[PDB]
Amino acid sequence: NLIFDVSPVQSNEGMLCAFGRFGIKYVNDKDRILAPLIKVNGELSKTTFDQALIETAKKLQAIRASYGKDSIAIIASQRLTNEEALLLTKLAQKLDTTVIGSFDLRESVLDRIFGLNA
Amino acid sequence: AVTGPKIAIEAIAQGKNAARVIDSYLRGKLEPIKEPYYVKQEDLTPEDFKDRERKPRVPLKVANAEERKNNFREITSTMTEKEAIAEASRCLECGCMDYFECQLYKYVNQYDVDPQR
Numbered sequence: 001n002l003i004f005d006v007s008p009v010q011s012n013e014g015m016l017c018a019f020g021r022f023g024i025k026y027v028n029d030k031d032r033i034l035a036p037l038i039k040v041n042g043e044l045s046k047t048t049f050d051q052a053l054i055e056t057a058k059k060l061q062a063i064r065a066s067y068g069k070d071s072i073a074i075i076a077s078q079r080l081t082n083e084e085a086l087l088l089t090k091l092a093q094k095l096d097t098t099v100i101g102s103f104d105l106r107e108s109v110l111d112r113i114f115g116l117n118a
Numbered sequence: 119a120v121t122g123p124k125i126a127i128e129a130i131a132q133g134k135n136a137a138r139v140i141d142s143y144l145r146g147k148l149e150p151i152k153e154p155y156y157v158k159q160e161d162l163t164p165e166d167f168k169d170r171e172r173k174p175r176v177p178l179k180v181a182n183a184e185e186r187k188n189n190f191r192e193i194t195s196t197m198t199e200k201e202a203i204a205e206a207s208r209c210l211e212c213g214c215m216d217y218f219e220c221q222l223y224k225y226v227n228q229y230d231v232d233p234q235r
């Protein structure tokens with residue numbers, strides 16, 4: 001279950017930068033959290049996935065109920081797969097929030113000129 | 119749907135009785151539910167238990183109001199095995215120990231006996 005090396009693929013110039021070649025070290029990192037944490041008595045403590053996800057859903061629903069629509073922001077990283085991003089968009093629709101974005105995202109200019117930001 | 123809004127155990131009792139009736143109907147002979155006649159003691163008074171040892175009830179673990187008024191986590195927690203055994207040992211054993219093998223009970227159930235007269 002440990003990664004031991006990373007090698008480039010001889011596709012074109014067969015090259016990897018520092019990140020792809022060496023930053024795969026975080027997979028073996030022992031500081032990774034493997035169980036969810038919820039706030040008991042004001043401190044984060046381990047729990048089960050079912051209870052944590054139930055708490056997440058109830059907290060989001062409480063925020064939506066008390067403060068109305070468009071009151072929940074989803075700030076998703078840009079390293080997720082296409083399916084995960086689509087699922088996050090679906091969930092944002094389920095929460096009646098259009099605030100679906102990322103802190104790594106810059107203001108777009110190309111979609112106002114050519115039509116697509118690509 | 120029949121009795122109106124009641125507690126859940128009433129609905130469960132209705133379901134069980136209806137299941138027994140439906141089984142009887144499927145077997146061919148539909149028989150309405152017949153309630154057995156039990157011998158019961160209604161003259162009992164607390165003075166009959168003045169000699170029994172007084173034992174405290176099992177404590178109830180209830181989450182703090184401030185911490186529980188913000189989440190949907192369960193309020194009460196299940197008892198422990200030791201507490202469960204100590205609580206179940208407080209029983210007075212009111213029912214007859216010979217209930218499942220008493221023949222007088224069987225016979226008074228087999229006949230429409232009116233004891234009050």
Ligand code: SF4
Pocket residue numbers: 208209210211212213
């Ligand atoms: S048999 Fe036990 S539980 Fe039932 S009424 Fe008597 S003391 Fe209570």
